[PDB]
Amino acid sequence: GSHMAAAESSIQVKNKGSIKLSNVKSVVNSSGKLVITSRNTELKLIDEFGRTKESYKVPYGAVLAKGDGEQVAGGETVANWDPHTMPVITEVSGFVRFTDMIDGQTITRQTDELTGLSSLVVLDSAERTAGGKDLRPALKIVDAQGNDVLIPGTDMPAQYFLPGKAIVQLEDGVQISSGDTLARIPQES
C-alpha cells in the first residue's frame, strides 16, 4: 500500500491492466531477475482500451517483475529497487578480477553486527593512505581462461572502477552474468 515506507522504492500498480514500458533496456542477471539498464525508463499502466492511467519513472538497476506488455492486477507490485543506493552493473558475463583492491589501502572489510555477513568497502580519498591515493580500485571482467572480455563491439576490455564508499557485492574470482550488480554506491547523508 501507501501506508508503508517501501512504497517509496517500488511500484505497486493501482488498477488492473497491462504494463507498457518505453525507452527500456533490460538484461536478465544470474539471479533470473530482469534488470533495467537504461536511465530513462518509464512504466505505464494501460487499461483495456489502450489508455494510460498511471505513469512512473523507473530507476536504473530496478528489477522488473514482468516484461513489457504483461497483464497485471491492481495492488500488484511490478518494479522494485534500492532507494538509498546506486548500482554499478556489469555489462558482460565472466569472472570478477580485482585490480588495485588492497585491504587497508583502497578497501576495507565491514561486518554487519546483526547478520555477521560482510562487504568490502572502497575507501574514499581521505580514508586512503598516501601510498593508495594514486591507485584506482576496479573490477575487471575476465573469462574462464583469465583473458579480457571486451565491452560489446569495441577494443575496450570491461573494467569497472569503483568510487569511494562503494560496497562490493561480488568478490575476487566470483562468476558473473551480464546484469549482475558489481557494487552499490551509498548516498550522502
What is the strand and helix layout of this fold?
Layout lengths: L9 E3 L4 E6 L3 E3 L5 E3 L5 E5 L5 E6 L5 E2 L6 E2 L4 E4 L4 E5 L4 E6 L7 E5 L6 E5 L15 E5 L16 E3 L5 E2 L6 E2 L4 E6 L3
Antiparallel strand pairs: 1-9, 2-5, 2-8, 3-4, 4-7, 5-6, 7-9, 10-18, 11-14, 11-17, 12-13, 14-15, 16-18
Organism: Escherichia coli (strain K12)
Family: Belongs to the RNA polymerase beta' chain family.
Protein name: DNA-directed RNA polymerase subunit beta'
Structure, explained:
The chain has 189 residues and is mostly beta strands. It folds into two domains: 1-82, Beta Barrel (OB fold (Dihydrolipoamide Acetyltransferase, E2P)); 83-189, RNA polymerase II/Efflux pump adaptor protein, barrel-sandwich hybrid domain (OB fold (Dihydrolipoamide Acetyltransferase, E2P)), CATH 2.40.50.100. The chain is built from no helices and 18 strands. Belongs to the RNA polymerase beta' chain family. This is DNA-directed RNA polymerase subunit beta'. The modification N6-acetyllysine is found at residue 44.
